From a paper:
Indanomycin is an antibiotic from the pyrroloketo­indane family which is known to act as an effective ionophoric agent against Gram-positive bacteria. IdmH is a homodimer, with the individual protomers consisting of an α+β barrel.
One variant, containing a deletion of residues 99–107, resulted in large, easily reproducible crystals in the cubic space group F23 [Supplementary Fig. S5(b)] from new crystallization conditions. The asymmetric unit comprises one copy of the IdmH-Δ99–107 dimer with the entire polypeptide chain successfully modelled into density, except for the N- and C-terminal regions. The remainder of the structural description will focus on the unlabelled native protein as this should best represent the natural form of the enzyme.
Author numbering:
A (entry chain B): 6 to 134
B (entry chain A): 7 to 134
Write the structure that this text describes.
Amino acid sequence: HQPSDTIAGLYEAFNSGDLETLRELIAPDAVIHLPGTAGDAEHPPGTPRDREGWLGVWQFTQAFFPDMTATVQDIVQTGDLVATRCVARGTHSGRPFEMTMLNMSRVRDGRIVEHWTISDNVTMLAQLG
Amino acid sequence: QPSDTIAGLYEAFNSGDLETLRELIAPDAVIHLPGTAGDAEHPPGTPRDREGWLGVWQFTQAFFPDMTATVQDIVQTGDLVATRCVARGTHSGRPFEMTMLNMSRVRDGRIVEHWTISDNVTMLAQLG
């Protein structure tokens, strides 16, 4: 049950802003598949990122939603593959939101080497307005 | 096995096989669809039942008649199955390829709870 621990560790490290642990748990050359909403001028939607590209998107999001946290609700593991359902919880200027995240991660030697994630942004925006 | 149920589900969606869909999904299943699937009568975040889900799926099928969903990775622990799928098609001459992530609870060979989200923004970027 090591890969499951890696992924649990990841979301805790994101919540705490723990860069050292994030960089331990994600390989520098990991293949990160972010959703189309995270696409920009340099990465069109569908283009994979590396670790530091992912951590860059995370930091941008955190600037807008400084109290946003992810809690793991369900986790399943088979071999080196871990899938998770999380709930992202925060407030936008005093109005609380609650958004589902679904993730799939490949772990090798206790490091994430591939990751897919999508968030239910439309539901979050419905809650805020 | 629960893995077999979920593999059967996506095959049944691809084939348009309503009979098998209704066998594999309990009528009272709790279906958590993304906010894009919300409307005037069912606000974003409100769970649906099977027939509500199959209603949204029929609209989606009618809109992208050549779309297929292929299970790429499947993980199982107990009664919980997660899948990564790729939805593929060609919409009016433009090919598209979009990730779907799903999580399903299976009991007695039927889906009783389901969460799904699809990377719609990437799909729309590929078409326009």
